Amino acid sequence: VRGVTVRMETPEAILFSPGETFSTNVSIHAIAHDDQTYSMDVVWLRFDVPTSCAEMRIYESCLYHPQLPECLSPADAPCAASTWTSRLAVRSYAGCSRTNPPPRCSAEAHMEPVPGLAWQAASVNLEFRDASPQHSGLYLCVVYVNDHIHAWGHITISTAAQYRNAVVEQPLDIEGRG
Amino acid sequence: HVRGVTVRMETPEAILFSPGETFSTNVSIHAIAHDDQTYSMDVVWLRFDVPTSCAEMRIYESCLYHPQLPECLSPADAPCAASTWTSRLAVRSYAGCSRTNPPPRCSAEAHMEPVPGLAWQAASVNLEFRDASPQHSGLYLCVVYVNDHIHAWGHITISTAAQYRNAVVEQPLDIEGRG
């Protein structure tokens, strides 16, 4: 029993109307099992969801290795979230530990310039002020601990008309089912 | 770097049943080995009594990782807390697992407590209840260990409507320092 455990909770969708102001409601808890220090990076990724797509496919395995060939050029081509170039936002923490919990170890933070996009100080939730159809899409919140993904989740933030179900393409389960 | 094993679990938080019904849990568990290291895995089911006088059950999340700590062995929340255990309802063990010899294939042992109407869903981690009765009502936790360390866990309150009590997860403050 060592390392860190990260648990994330959040609804898989947020339907909004044009002109509405809202915030994501992601809950993230970090449990340090030893007295080792650790770094943490909470990263937001955004993906366009084409009208022609019946659903958006998230290549789970690709999240850990977004530089792989099959990830850079997803077979489901237009309807797949398997890699990224720019990160919508990133909140970094350094020197975290059992006695110096995440809030206190806050270090740096970055956010891409997007109309109406913002976040509270020391917060990882995203706020959309005066939202519009331009903001609709698939958003992933990925939590790294010591540069390795420890937890992740997806939220389809969209107007009802633009909404498309997000499906997680994962490897076979422990029962060998796909 | 990217190493070790990642376990993801999904399941509804409650199953309401009427006496005499036959049903099964529907837990989904995926394991992703990021390297070629060999590992062991244990899928453990824990069952907790839910007293009629409890307003709600409280799960001490941090305690699941160290069930032998004093505050976990003697939970402050009367008999309405899930924070430690002795007997394990069921355990499916896997050995010699790896990226190329994934879980189903590395299945090794399976154990289950003798309980009227309870059975291991053949080749599955789910629990099946036949001719379910009030005796089966309670708070169930499914915990997945990898190399003897919890990598994922979930809870399911399985019971009749009359015996049902909401289960709340008591967690430390979040990364924003708000709990």
Residue numbers in the entry:
A (entry chain B): 219 to 396
B (entry chain A): 218 to 396
Provide the authors' own sentences about this structure as they appear in the paper:
Herpes simplex virus type-1 expresses a heterodimeric Fc receptor, gE-gI, on the surfaces of virions and infected cells that binds the Fc region of host immunoglobulin G and is implicated in the cell-to-cell spread of virus. gE-gI binds immunoglobulin G at the basic pH of the cell surface and releases it at the acidic pH of lysosomes, consistent with a role in facilitating the degradation of antiviral antibodies. HSV-1 gE-gI is a heterodimer composed of two type I membrane glycoproteins: gE, a 530-residue protein including a ˜401-residue extracellular region followed by a predicted single transmembrane helix and a ˜106-residue C-terminal cytoplasmic tail; and gI, a 370-residue protein including a ˜248-residue extracellular portion followed by a predicted single transmembrane helix, and a ˜94-residue C-terminal cytoplasmic tail. Here we report the structures of CgE, an Fc-binding fragment of the HSV-1 Fc receptor gE-gI, and a gE-gI complex with Fc.
Here we identify the C-terminal domain of the gE ectodomain (CgE) as the minimal Fc-binding domain and present a 1.78-Å CgE structure. The first and second β-sheets in CgE, which correspond to their counterparts in Ig V domains, contain strands A, B, B′, E, and D, and strands A′, G, F, C, C′, and C′′, respectively. The CgE fold lacks the disulfide bond that joins the A′GFCC′C′′ and the DEBB′A sheets in the canonical Ig fold, with CgE containing a cysteine in strand F (Cys359) but a valine in the complementary position in strand B (Val244). However, the conserved tryptophan normally found in strand C adjacent to the intersheet disulfide bond is present in CgE (Trp262). Even within the region of CgE that resembles an Ig V domain, CgE has a different disulfide-bonding pattern and is longer and more open than others in the Ig superfamily. Differences between the pIgR and CgE Ig V folds include the positions of the CDR loops, the predicted Fc-binding sites (described for CgE below), the overall size, with CgE being larger due to its extended strands C, C′, and C′′, and the third β-sheet in CgE, which is absent in pIgR domain 1. However, the structures of CgE and a gE-gI/Fc complex reported here can be used to identify which insertions are likely to disrupt the CgE structure and which insertions are likely to affect function. The structural effects of insertions after gE positions 277 and 291 are difficult to interpret due to their location near disulfide bonds in the third β-sheet of CgE.
